[PDB]
Design a protein around this ligand. Structure first.
Ligand code: CL
Ligand code: CL
Ligand code: NA
Ligand code: NA
Lengths: 468, 468
């Protein structure tokens, strides 16, 4: 609980929940958003059942996630799955850091002190933030162990503030920005999808959303340090998945039934007595959102404003603190996981080239080189400075890693390996096979060339080892 | 020569050479057509080197192509490669039959006696033609052995007639339909691509053209009946590939340097002095092709008329006879190959289900059931009655078969199997690996979902057997 459930819930809850989920709901309608969430949760639930079977298998040693997977499924697939997982965690660090940078940039713009321009402002904020994160990670772990509860408390306060703000009747300033109390007609209108933009498709938004359902391996990271990991890991992981899914569904429905898609934000844009016009719901409450809809120059609303969740709630700085806590926790966990995976992969000497990056230093032999490699990849991907572009890469790589773990578990089951005998009672071979197949199909549906690159990397890694 | 080179040359030369190659040239320009031809010939030449290495391996027995491949590379991949090859040959039978049906429909329309409507006319003509082909194939082989030389002579006469017609200065009726003598400006204009229609893309037209470079396995079909197959098969196959490539290149350049893209066909459409608005290279010879160019209703020309190779030549019925000979030879060879592959695959009892279709009948134990299955698939695909729609499926399936044979040969080379030791001196492992990789990449560039289906079928077949 204190080392399995809470860590998984903190790693899963990240940047997408606070900045892109209302936008995804507005773009894709509540029903299709629910379908996206349910499909992603089925994929992650099959993966979680496979992970629980792996963790329950045999005797758990103090080796970590990569060591557990390697000793459960053999090094031939363990090396490739570890490398892909590490790359996915590094690009996830980049995504969480750029989300934090966007939040800080918006806060600075609210102060009214821009530096040069929004994109480069994001760039400097992200690089400074990731450098500070590297310094903190190299400092020690007691601070983050103490700050885990702080992050949890802050995010819970953020959730409570959001719910209270939804329950409060709308104010004039919030009404001008497209926020009204719970309404049946708003829910009816938001039931149907309304696509916009270049990435306004079902599978594009699935690719954007999917990183918000990842992070289920975190509970396994400290499998060796748990007193009773064999019972704690599966129940904790599954409960974390269930509660995060419930939170996603509730937030999606509540935000979709409360605010309209298009808003102007102009305070003097009320529906004056005498001549005036009706646009959608607005006219029913004394607002005229016509010209903003026609010229497509709406700076606010659920479909245009990414920070509408902060506007809806009662006291915005609590939401900002929740965003900071979620992003920092997710980014730090991803960085630690990537560094540990890189170090442990280089320890086993899978390839002669990777060995030169496996010589740790420091008093406690901390793997400085792995942290520096992860930092370099994180900066290289932060240079992009676009959340909607970094998200699909992580979606693709996490889908590939889940496909490999599911298919490897299926192959071990069907082949009847001598040393592989799980004791989990909810594991089935055909469920894992279906999960692997559907994950590969979704991977190719999202982006075919990225899927080809990932499969080519998998085949290269395997074939190289199987041959040599 | 008489059993390797000529058979390969007759099987390669088919419907695409006579009906779609001028259209492909008009769509994609001479330079890109040459690039398409060279890329396709590179793939087929790597596959031909692999085939030559397989044929040279060990001692050749009277078993045919499937038996040779299975005894050279093992049954695990042999079964899957045979099944995919048989399916590709069946759909190729469908393609050649529908091309023959289109030719007969055009002849009937020229006679002025349509039956019901062009598409269903194609349907009945194709069904009757494939039934007659089945009856002829079940009759005996002496007739086709005697008619091979007739088909060769007819197609050579067709080529000579085409060249002579190109050399003859244009006539008034041919000029009105868009045919002029060799011209530098026409060549210059046709050097640049001009895309049109829904499939007017580089890779779509590659998919359409690719079946015209296939049929290189035919020379191996009678490997057991050759006195000296080990020397005859590689040289014959490579010479056939070279000469077919030269013919394709020469025909493409000659047709692209001789006829303009757009033509009207109206005989009274000359450029009367002082009248008619003028555009295009037809106004240099006293023609006014502007009106149909603006309305996009040009019924003739290289860009619209599929039967322009017949009008270009001197005496059209010779071209029609050549079309009949090429299509009949290709279709009959594909049907025989598909039936033989189906029968030999069912003989080995790879799967329990396929055995029920492996019980041959007749006095000589001819595989009637395999012929009926191939006939059923051929009719099911003829029902489509569209050459440009049947072609990509065949492209994908030969691409899959070639990728599998190349990769299997590479794997046998690198793994150093005990019984696999070719003696061909032009074979290299990395060439085969490059061929397999480029074939898979081209497959996914053509159609990603068809590629996924083919790879899933391969994995299902390979995995089923590897597990059981
Ligand atoms: Cl994860
Ligand atoms: Cl072939
Ligand atoms: Na978090
Ligand atoms: Na032919």
């Amino acid at each position: 609980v204190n080392g399995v459930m809470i860590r998984c819930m903190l790693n899963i809850w990240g940047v997408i929940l606070y900045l892109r989920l209302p936008w995804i709901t507005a773009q894709a309608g509540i029903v299709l958003t629910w379908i996206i969430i349910l499909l992603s949760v089925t994929v992650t639930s099959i993966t979680g059942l496979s992970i629980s079977a792996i963790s329950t298998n045999g005797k758990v040693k103090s080796g970590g996630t990569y060591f557990l997977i390697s000793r459960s499924l053999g090094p031939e697939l363990g090396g490739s799955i570890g490398l892909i997982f590490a790359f996915a965690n590094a690009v996830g660090v980049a995504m969480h850091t750029v989300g934090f940078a966007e939040t800080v940039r918006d806060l600075l713009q609210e102060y009214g002190a821009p530096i040069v321009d929004p994109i480069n402002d994001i760039r400097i904020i992200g690089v400074v933030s990731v450098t500070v994160l590297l310094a903190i990670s190299l400092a020690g772990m007691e601070w983050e162990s103490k700050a885990q509860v702080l992050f949890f408390l802050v995010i819970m306060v953020s959730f409570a503030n959001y719910l209270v703000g939804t329950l409060i009747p709308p104010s004039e300033d919030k009404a001008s920005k497209g926020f009204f109390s719970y309404r049946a007609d708003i829910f009816v209108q938001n039931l149907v999808p309304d696509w916009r933009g270049p990435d306004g498709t079902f599978f594009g938004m699935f690719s954007i959303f999917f990183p918000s359902a990842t992070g289920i391996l975190a509970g396994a990271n400290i499998s060796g340090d748990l007193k009773d990991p064999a019972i704690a890991i599966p129940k904790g992981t599954l409960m974390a998945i269930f509660w995060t899914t419930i939170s996603y569904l509730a937030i999606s429905a509540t935000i979709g039934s409360c605010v309209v898609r298009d808003a102007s934000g102009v305070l003097n844009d009320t529906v004056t007595p005498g001549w005036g016009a009706c646009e959608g719901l607005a006219c029913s409450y004394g607002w005229n959102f016509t010209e903003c809809t026609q010229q497509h120059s709406c700076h606010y609303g659920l479909i245009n404003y990414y920070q509408t969740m902060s506007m809806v709630s009662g006291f915005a700085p609590l939401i900002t603190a929740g965003i900071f806590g979620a992003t920092l926790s997710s980014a730090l966990a991803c960085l630690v996981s990537a560094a540990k995976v890189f170090q442990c992969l280089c320890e086993d000497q899978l390839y002669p080239l990777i060995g030169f990056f496996g010589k740790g230093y420091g008093k406690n032999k901390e793997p400085v080189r792995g942290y520096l490699l992860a930092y370099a990849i994180a900066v290289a991907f932060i240079i992009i400075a676009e959340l909607n572009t970094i998200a699909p890469i992580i979606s693709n790589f996490f889908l590939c890693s889940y496909a490999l773990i599911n298919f490897s578990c299926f192959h071990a089951s069907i082949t009847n390996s001598p040393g592989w005998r799980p004791s989990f009672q909810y594991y089935n071979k055909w469920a894992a096979l279906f999960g692997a197949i559907i994950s590969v199909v979704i991977m190719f549906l999202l982006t075919w060339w990225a899927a080809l690159i990932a499969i080519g990397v998998v085949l290269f890694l395997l074939l190289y080892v199987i041959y040599k």
